[PDB]
Design a protein around this ligand. Structure first.
Ligand SMILES: Nc1ncnc2c1ncn2[C@@H]1O[C@H](COP(=O)(O)OP(=O)(O)O)[C@@H](O)[C@H]1O
Ligand SMILES: Nc1ncnc2c1ncn2[C@@H]1O[C@H](COP(=O)(O)OP(=O)(O)O)[C@@H](O)[C@H]1O
Ligand SMILES: Nc1ncnc2c1ncn2[C@@H]1O[C@H](COP(=O)(O)OP(=O)(O)O)[C@@H](O)[C@H]1O
Lengths: 458, 446, 458
């Protein structure tokens, strides 16, 4: 094997830009870990395993390290992958070998890039892809329940995407939490840009505030490599000093660089995204039996699948009506897109998958009274090693369900569409102000709704 | 000891952007300090994607040709079969050797002997590993590595701070191997009309080394027979000859198989090229080999989110490949599987996954799973909607396929042309394509 | 555990009769292994794993040993079976223990009787028959990629039947080859007969040439036990000297001996086989758009399933037309048999399974335009641990496929049949000259076609 960071890294929370919540919510880990001792015996406690979710290069590792390097014990990191790639049984041996090594530091941090390599299980990817994960994983879970308070330590996992994880990983006693981080906040990329922008000279005409405002985009790692990029552009021309445009174009170079091919969020992909996010937002927003909440933006990217998931997994009981209205909201995105654009639409799925599920649900599992009664065509359990969904009906019923569900969805969809277009003018507005400025708080959101402008002086 | 390294690309043929995307490195290699103070930095290690004898090692030092600085050699095999801890102890002395040599290159060879996924080799691994991690900004170093199969190389090595990077070097060409045979033309004379100009041709798919070796022994086939000098024929024979053993160990393809493959790629290319509300891309070739691989990967990473018709235009392109064939050819066809496999996998996508509106709609009948080891879709729906999905997918496809067949049918010359030139001149690039397209030949350019 | 042959066996290539190709194709292993050293560093190389395919007792082991005792390192043999019979995890431990032991001899030979015990994998023989073989197998695969040139060594596998092996084993770096051996060549059984015929006296009237010519039959082990048999017949009557007929009848005794029951290739089973082989041969042979090749015989026995397999697995692109014509050829066998014989036919399958497969293929996988379009109803991949075929359509389509396929086959069949009977007179001829003489080279094959005889003086 693993990676030990000997006795302190460098870096800390003054080396990370933005993301307050993440920061302060992790507080209690940071300084708690300063003192484990007087701590546990005081009746207080800790998650003692932690996950954050964000894009690649959002500052995950970065944050983790800032913690590890401030509150601070060695930062022991490994990548999930390093694991499953291995054989039957050797995997387990490791999860532990890793731990014990990390364990003798009380307190300490286990940080694991990409725990996706483990969390999940099945009976479908049959024969090659099942056993291991759950296997070596438990080794980790057993490790997790295998403590008590003495050892102050924190397991820290990074992945772009909460779900692919078996929910077994969220249980109390290990990672019992979620902190997602949308880094690319304007001020965020200001601060970020800069911290990296120094090792290098700047033509005066360079002022971050404007580059920053016009990047988005954009992400921490993205930015750094942009900057570093420009620096070297000059570096190779035997040159010296980088005016704004060098940095600029470096921004483009990077912008077309990612993956193996040209792929760019252009003067639209943003637009599209924003008309969407407006679609949802606007939808969730109505009066007289409005069902939903409010928090708008651009580029969260792990979360759109929150409705059910975050709250579903704890408990509380939903109203049918609601569920539909919300399904409607899910489809809001597409609806918008169809409304405004070329009546060509965009491979932007998860929404459907949600609404779909909510409905397959409505029919089978929760009694909701289509032509299928209050009878349970769906069982799903969460057993300590278990906790997933599989179910008994007959080809026929299974089909009656495909039909019904498609109907639920369609009908609902058509509703939300009609509503959006009804409010269209508003649709554009929100969409727009959004796409250029890229964030709104629920209030001023609604504010742009009444057709009355606002901005803050800054 | 170590001083002025050899060659340079002045003796290297083709592989342009490869290098001058290297020139960045070569430079730091000459002028290192220039960054640290300056707050700049470099890939710090690099690898090559290509067969054996493509000019990999060749370029790996050719850099040092201009970068002009000790160019250190360590093969991967040696590390394995020494012994315990020595398997490590070597690689170690290895760098600090390469080291206060700042600037300079450290080439390693046949990584697989190391870069894999129970003791030995991976101690070499963890060793190499830690160093580069055991490391600093200030220090000026570029490691080198070359392999024919990025695949089995344990992806750990491919991290950041490590090789976050590389270049594929496409082995032959029609000109490429000519101009290579060239750099190797000087040593020895010869009397025929041919310049190798065509000889390059008479050699189908072929690699730089496989050329050089060929030559030398043509010059021997010379020297022996009491020779001055070489004949077109001599080499030529040296070629077909040295060949017949790789003919066992490698593949020849008939004046037909070529044909088609040229026509396919022609049809593909065209299909992604058209006017008035329609969508595509461009670059083209025939590479008897690198082809087969180049595909798997884009599937594993196949990602962006693209717009509904686009996908129909894609579908249009794959099926376009076949269609081209059917049109221009003897009215028989050929296992050209993967095109279909993916027009299929797209359309099937569009139905069951990305809400796109056959009589299916905004519901999610299939879901994907993700990240890497695998990534791909779990299916939830009942036999009927399965039947439907099939029916629909068949239409979607057949619809497109008869559409593209239409396009290709008509623009048919252009099909011809692109195919022909391509066929004989093993590759096209970007621009000239458009040219070949419009009543416009090329002469001997640059 | 395993079997070490201490420091040289006896036996060599002058102890093996016939089978030139096998011999000389293996050359480079033989003498290469004499010198591993100057060898690998010269840029040359080796398969370093090798399989041959032939009946039981064809001289497989025999050949392998001849190599090992000549080119020569100890001959380390084991049987595949000795393996799978074992428990979870212990298998692997062995493959290796075996190797290491064999490995310290540089160079050396691993020869494994009957590797069938491993190569294969699934998701069908579910629960008892899958895991381990792929498991312990990989152990062997990993062993295989686990080298480099230093160690000159050869893994040598024997099995009557290429297919049951997972294609994963054919990959370069380890067994990347096939050498099949039809031993029972006339001259073959001459030479063989004799080498064994010594230890014993012979009535003068005994001349091998004739026994040999009239054995076939017949195989090396078969023969030896025949001979040894006669010898003992006499041995038990307190007797001395074996005239021709003792050897003869020994031939019969053996001929009814095999398995647990009477089973004989009689004065027909040959005939049948011959009419078949002629059926194929004759079929593959036409003009004006003939599609196929030529190489006739009796008793190859591993190969009839070559069309696709050998060439399929590397690459090159087939013409539909062809594929049909060839399918037609596959069915040629049955067709003939139906034509000439009692309109009862013979449980001789593989052909059908072939044609069938080529068609199931044509429809689903390769675009070929029945009522199913150029759409991919078949995926099959070769992934390094993977490399097999499984596929997504709907009961309905699956069925449309059953129909279509049976039609393809039937229709094609009916074609070849008509063709054969059209050429019947020729059919017989080839069939016949064959049955008695048991081999033809493609040319003289045809010659017998024009109705003009030939033979060589010998
Ligand atoms: N908020 C940030 N501030 C400074 N640097 C950042 C930030 N976010 C990303 N980076 C750059 O990216 C690196 C960390 O990437 P990270 O976000 O951990 O990737 P992932 O999202 O896959 O965890 C850091 O070393 C840093 O240079
Ligand atoms: N572009 C090229 N120009 C000149 N020679 C080349 C070129 N490509 C390959 N060669 C010849 O092939 C030989 C081997 O090339 P290389 O790719 O280093 O082999 P390997 O793949 O075994 O490392 C070189 O010594 C060189 O003479
Ligand atoms: N070509 C041959 N020459 C001499 N003996 C042979 C030959 N083929 C088979 N035999 C006899 O059979 C034995 C080898 O059997 P073998 O062919 O290896 O069985 P399998 O086909 O199962 O490998 C030899 O010891 C020998 O007695």
């Amino acid at each position: 094997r693993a990676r030990v960071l000997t006795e302190a890294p460098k870096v800390t929370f003054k080396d990370v830009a933005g993301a307050e919540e993440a920061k302060e919510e992790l507080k209690e880990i940071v300084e708690f870990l300063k003192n484990p001792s007087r701590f546990h015996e005081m009746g207080a406690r800790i998650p003692k395993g932690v996950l954050l979710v964000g894009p690649p290069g959002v500052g995950k590792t970065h944050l983790a390290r800032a913690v590890a390097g401030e509150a601070r014990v060695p930062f022991i990191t490994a990548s999930g992958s390093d694991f499953v790639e291995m054989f039957v049984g050797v995997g387990a041996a490791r999860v532990r070998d890793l731990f014990e090594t990390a364990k003798r530091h009380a307190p300490c941090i286990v940080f694991i890039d990409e725990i996706d390599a483990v969390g999940r299980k099945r009976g479908s990817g049959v024969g090659g892809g099942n056993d291991e994960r759950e296997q070596t994983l438990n080794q980790l879970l057993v490790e997790m329940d295998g403590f008590e308070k003495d050892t102050a330590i924190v397991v820290m996992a990074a992945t772009n995407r909460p779900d692919i994880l078996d929910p077994a990983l969220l249980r109390p006693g290990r990672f019992d939490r979620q902190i997602a981080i949308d880094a690319p906040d304007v001020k965020g990329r200001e601060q970020i840009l800069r911290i990296h922008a120094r090792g290098k000279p700047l033509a005066e005409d360079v002022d971050l505030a404007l580059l920053a405002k016009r990047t988005p985009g954009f992400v921490g790692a993205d930015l750094e490599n942009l900057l570093n990029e420009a620096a070297l552009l000059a570096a190779r021309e035997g040159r010296r000093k980088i005016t704004m445009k060098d940095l600029e174009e470096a921004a483009d170079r990077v912008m077309m660089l990612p993956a193996k091919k040209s792929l760019v969020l252009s003067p639209r992909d943003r637009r599209i995204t924003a008309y969407h996010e407006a679609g949802h937002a606007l939808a969730a927003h109505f009066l007289e039996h409005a069902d939903g909440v409010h928090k708008v933006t651009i580029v969260p990217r792990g979360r759109a699948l929150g409705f059910m998931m975050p709250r579903r997994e704890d408990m509380l009981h939903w109203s049918r009506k609601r569920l539909l209205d919300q399904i409607a909201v899910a489809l809001a995105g597409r609806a918008a897109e169809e409304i405004v654009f070329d009546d060509v639409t965009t491979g932007a799925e998860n929404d459907f998958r949600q609404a779909t599920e909510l409905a397959r649900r409505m029919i089978t599992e929760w009694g909701m009274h289509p032509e299928f009664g209050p009878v349970a065509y769906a069982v799903r359990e969460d057993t300590y090693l278990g906790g997933y969904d599989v179910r008994q009906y007959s080809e026929e019923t299974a089909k009656r369900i495909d039909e019904a569900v498609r109907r639920l969805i369609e009908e609902q969809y058509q509703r939300v569409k009609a509503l959006l277009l009804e409010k269209r003018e508003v649709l554009e507005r929100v969409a727009e102000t959004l796409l250029e400025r890229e964030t709104l708080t629920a209030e001023e959101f609604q504010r742009v709704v009444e057709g009355l402008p606002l901005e803050a002086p800054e």
